[PDB]
Amino acid sequence: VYAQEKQDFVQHFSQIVRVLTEGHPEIGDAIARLKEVLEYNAIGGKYNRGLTVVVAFRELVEPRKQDADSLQRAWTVGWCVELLQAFFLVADDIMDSSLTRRGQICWYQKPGVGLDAINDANLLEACIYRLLKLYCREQPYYLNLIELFLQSSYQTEIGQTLDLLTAPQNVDLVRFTEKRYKSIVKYKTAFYSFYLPIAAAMYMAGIDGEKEHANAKKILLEMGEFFQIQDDYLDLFGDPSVTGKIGTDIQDNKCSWLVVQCLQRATPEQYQILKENYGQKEAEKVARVKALYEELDLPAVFLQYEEDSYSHIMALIEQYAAPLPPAVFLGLARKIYKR
Amino acid sequence: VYAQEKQDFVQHFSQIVRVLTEGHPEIGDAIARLKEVLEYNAIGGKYNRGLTVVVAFRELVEPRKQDADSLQRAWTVGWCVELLQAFFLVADDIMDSSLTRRGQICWYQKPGVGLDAINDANLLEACIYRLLKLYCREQPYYLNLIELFLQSSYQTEIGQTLDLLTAPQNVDLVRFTEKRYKSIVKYKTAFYSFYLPIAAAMYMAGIDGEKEHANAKKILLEMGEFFQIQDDYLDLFGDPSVTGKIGTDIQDNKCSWLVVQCLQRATPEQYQILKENYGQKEAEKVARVKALYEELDLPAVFLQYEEDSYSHIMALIEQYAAPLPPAVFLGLARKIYKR
Ligand SMILES: Cc1ccc(-c2cc3c(N[C@@H](Cc4ccccc4)C(=O)NP(=O)(O)O)ncnc3s2)cc1
Ligand SMILES: Cc1ccc(-c2cc3c(N[C@@H](Cc4ccccc4)C(=O)NP(=O)(O)O)ncnc3s2)cc1
Ligand SMILES: Cc1ccc(-c2cc3c(N[C@@H](Cc4ccccc4)C(=O)NP(=O)(O)O)ncnc3s2)cc1
Ligand SMILES: Cc1ccc(-c2cc3c(N[C@@H](Cc4ccccc4)C(=O)NP(=O)(O)O)ncnc3s2)cc1
């Protein structure tokens, strides 16, 4: 499904840019900057979210209604998801004071960008809507897509606010509850990473019903919870030469699924070991946390969670996939649940 | 027109907030933060942009079609303009490293906000669209308003990019040309400050024609150019006990209308006096610029510009106001051109 169309998708970017950078010579300079912004930040991910739109649109539309223009539009809206992602990242890395991203210098950290990245992020967001105007204003789902991107923006922003309130990078754990962890993930990542791209395909295919969308959302948000929990696990236990990432959740005082669990289980004594070491950057003090999680057999708790999670998803799919082809959902679960 | 409805408008804010902060207990914390963001940043301006929507809607709709619900919606969309303004300011003050705004500490500069303001700004933007959903999704102009706010966002962002490229707060004047000054003002401030609110009233009143809108835009953008040029003049020559502002365009290396003119007129010698002193914060070095502008009789050049500008506007109004009541436009020119 995905490896099979990643070429046409990543190749269409050029067009996405050509159009977004074309009557008005006076502003050409700013447009030059926009090009640069898009080239640095929309590129270099694995493109799974955007791609999900394309793949799903193939699965959902009767192939008789998949002309060149229709596909073009699915590529375009797929790139709209990747631009939403890019907008959030650029802005999130400023906020976290991150150094790298996708293995390069964060955009804001480049010489002579700095906090100008704030506006660059805002343009990334704007390009979504330009693109929808240009490719979709005549389509019957035009407004549905706008509302979905705008709503996907809002929930992510809310989730971000929620995380910022939860984890002031300053030492506190009583606010790291499972209720709250789950909330953060739903609003901050799941909605836009899992629901938004399938939903966009759905609208593109004429499937606009609230019921259908509620059903698909129910599956997708639970998939999204898992995805993140696995991300949290692998931040620390992922072989880094598989992953590509080397993890810093413990140094960055994150509200990781791990710590949440660790806190549910710890003696009042061990809370101390964690109160003392979480957030510090001393390797010794980072080791004494990993080593605590390990003492609490949390890698086992994960495996245990991944199994249940895998059933729940299949159950959800059995129950709510209809009348969409289960393959829409399985195509994603495949990308997540390795054996 | 304006003093006459500023009460109902500023009073409606409470409702705007009540609604934007109301099913979902898990996120209530973030909503609390949102409330705070809106209270600090949507409040304390003079509300001229928002108000323009309300006043214009009164002028444009047959009074038989101005029920309670219609008004409610004009207040709401007026507040949407003020939220757009708030979103841009919060983000612009981070970018400039400003200290104050509307006579208080900039939001980002408050203890324990910082660059979290980036997300706070993004929520300000989001609230626009929530508000439009809640009050206007059933109206026939719903999509027109979304497109207008989104487009107003994009042009402002472009203008911001353009300004950032023009004025790196690092010393340069060859890029401060009149063509470029004019471009910056059109994209960065005029469009959203002058065109957007009248346009929103227009759409609200059933007047959606491209022609009408082109006409209104033509008047409004030229009004907007003046407004800004006057702002630039008064930044330096405004009696500060009238204004409320004390100006720092020269210290901040801005691409002010003043400097632009100064550069058009200066001997190759005087370019030097300006190359040496513009952007410095030394009062002596700030004085030696003001004193140069004064030596070049620029306060006279302004008066000269304000006169011509005043004719051009009236001409534009005579020519393009129809079939809107000229009073829509005069109501604004009144707020700008004191004798
Ligand atoms: C800890 C743990 C326990 C069980 C699993 C299971 C994964 C899995 C599974 N995973 C697929 C991925 C998958 C998932 C869902 C639908 C389709 C495909 C897989 O790993 N295929 P591969 O050829 O690479 O070994 N497919 C069918 N049953 C199961 S049970 C994964 C992790
Ligand atoms: C909607 C959506 C968003 C992100 C993803 C990502 C999947 C993924 C990823 N998944 C692996 C699978 C995987 C399984 C277990 C642990 C890590 C990685 C994968 O794509 N395998 P495939 O053989 O299909 O190319 N690996 C590294 N980064 C990412 S980011 C998937 C779906
Ligand atoms: C430098 C300079 C030269 C001429 C003017 C003019 C302002 C003006 C003008 N201004 C109105 C404001 C105005 C503008 C446009 C339409 C209506 C009202 C005004 O100042 N009224 P006020 O009672 O406070 O003295 N009205 C009619 N003709 C003119 S000519 C302003 C500044
Ligand atoms: C669309 C729009 C946006 C901002 C304005 C502003 C007008 C204004 C403003 N205008 C003065 C007039 C003015 C004239 C000349 C110099 C300064 C101020 C005014 O409102 N007079 P009014 O008697 O109607 O209350 N003074 C201080 N700040 C601002 S911000 C007007 C219209």
UniProtKB/Swiss-Prot annotation, chains A, B:
Binding residues for isopentenyl diphosphate: K46, R49, Q85, R102
Catalyses which reaction(s): isopentenyl diphosphate + dimethylallyl diphosphate = (2E)-geranyl diphosphate + diphosphate; isopentenyl diphosphate + (2E)-geranyl diphosphate = (2E,6E)-farnesyl diphosphate + diphosphate
Summary of subunit composition and partner proteins: Homodimer. Interacts with RSAD2. (Microbial infection) Interacts with HTLV-1 protein p13(II).
Residues that span the membrane, as ranges: none
Homology family: Belongs to the FPP/GGPP synthase family.
Pathway in which this enzyme or protein is active: Isoprenoid biosynthesis; farnesyl diphosphate biosynthesis; farnesyl diphosphate from geranyl diphosphate and isopentenyl diphosphate: step 1/1; Isoprenoid biosynthesis; geranyl diphosphate biosynthesis; geranyl diphosphate from dimethylallyl diphosphate and isopentenyl diphosphate: step 1/1
Top-level taxonomic group: Eukaryota
Organism, scientific name: Homo sapiens (Human)
Residues the record lists as N6-acetyllysine modifications: K46, K275
Encoding gene, per UniProt annotation: FDPS
Protein name: Farnesyl pyrophosphate synthase
Subcellular location: Cytoplasm
Entry binding sites for Mg(2+) 1: D92, D96
N6-(2-hydroxyisobutyryl)lysine: residues bearing it: K46
Disease: Porokeratosis 9, multiple types: A form of porokeratosis, a disorder of faulty keratinization characterized by one or more atrophic patches surrounded by a distinctive hyperkeratotic ridgelike border called the cornoid lamella. The keratotic lesions can progress to overt cutaneous neoplasms, typically squamous cell carcinomas. Multiple clinical variants of porokeratosis are recognized, including porokeratosis of Mibelli, linear porokeratosis, disseminated superficial actinic porokeratosis, palmoplantar porokeratosis, and punctate porokeratosis.
Residues of the full protein shown: 75 to 417 of 419
Binding site for dimethylallyl diphosphate: R101, K188, T189, Q228, K245, K254
